[PDB]
Amino acid sequence: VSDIVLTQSPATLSLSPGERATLSCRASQSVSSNYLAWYQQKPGQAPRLLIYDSSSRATGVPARFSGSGSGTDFTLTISSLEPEDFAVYYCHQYSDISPTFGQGTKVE
């Protein structure tokens, strides 16, 4: 009974407060207009917008979050971790008809 695949890396990151977290999102095809977003999700809560348009940081998001990349390789960097930043992070492409998400990276 019956698109563009997003692959995040690494699957897991173990870090301490103050350290840098670098997250990868690699698309199977080029993401037109760089319509790629990053969300933060804490356990039991709704996802939270961090960055959209690949590099645009949402209102109220601390400057320690930053996105980069174009085409098929995008990266989210958390420059100096706080203990409330430990969560699962998803990338998301909205450049087509069938929006897709990465499967998430756990930052513990």
Partner 1 sequence: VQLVESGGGLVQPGGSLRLSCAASGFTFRNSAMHWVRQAPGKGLEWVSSIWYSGSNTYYADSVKGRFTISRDNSKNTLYLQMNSLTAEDTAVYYCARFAGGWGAYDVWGQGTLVTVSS
Partner 2 sequence: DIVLTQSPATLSLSPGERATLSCRASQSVSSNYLAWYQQKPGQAPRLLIYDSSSRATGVPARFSGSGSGTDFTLTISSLEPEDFAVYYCHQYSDISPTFGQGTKVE
* Nearer Cβ to partner 2 (26/48): 26
- Find the binding residues for partner 1 in span 51-80 (CB under 8 A): 53-59, 68-70
The residue with tokens 């390789």 is: 73
Is beta strand 21-27 parallel, antiparallel or unpaired with respect to 105-107?
A: unpaired
Q: Does residue 44 belong to the site contacting partner 1 (CB under 8 A)?
A: yes
Look at residue 54 and give the partner it binds from a copy of itself, partner 1, partner 2, none, a contact being a CB closer than 5 to 8 Å depending on partner kind.
partner 1
Binding residue (CB under 8 A) for partner 2 from 3, 10, 17, 103: 10
Burial readout 26-62 (b: 16 or more C-beta within 10 A, e: otherwise): bbeeebeebebbbbbeeeeeebeebbbebeebeeebe
Given the rule CB under 8 A, which residues bind partner 2? 9-16, 18-20, 22, 24, 26, 28-30, 73
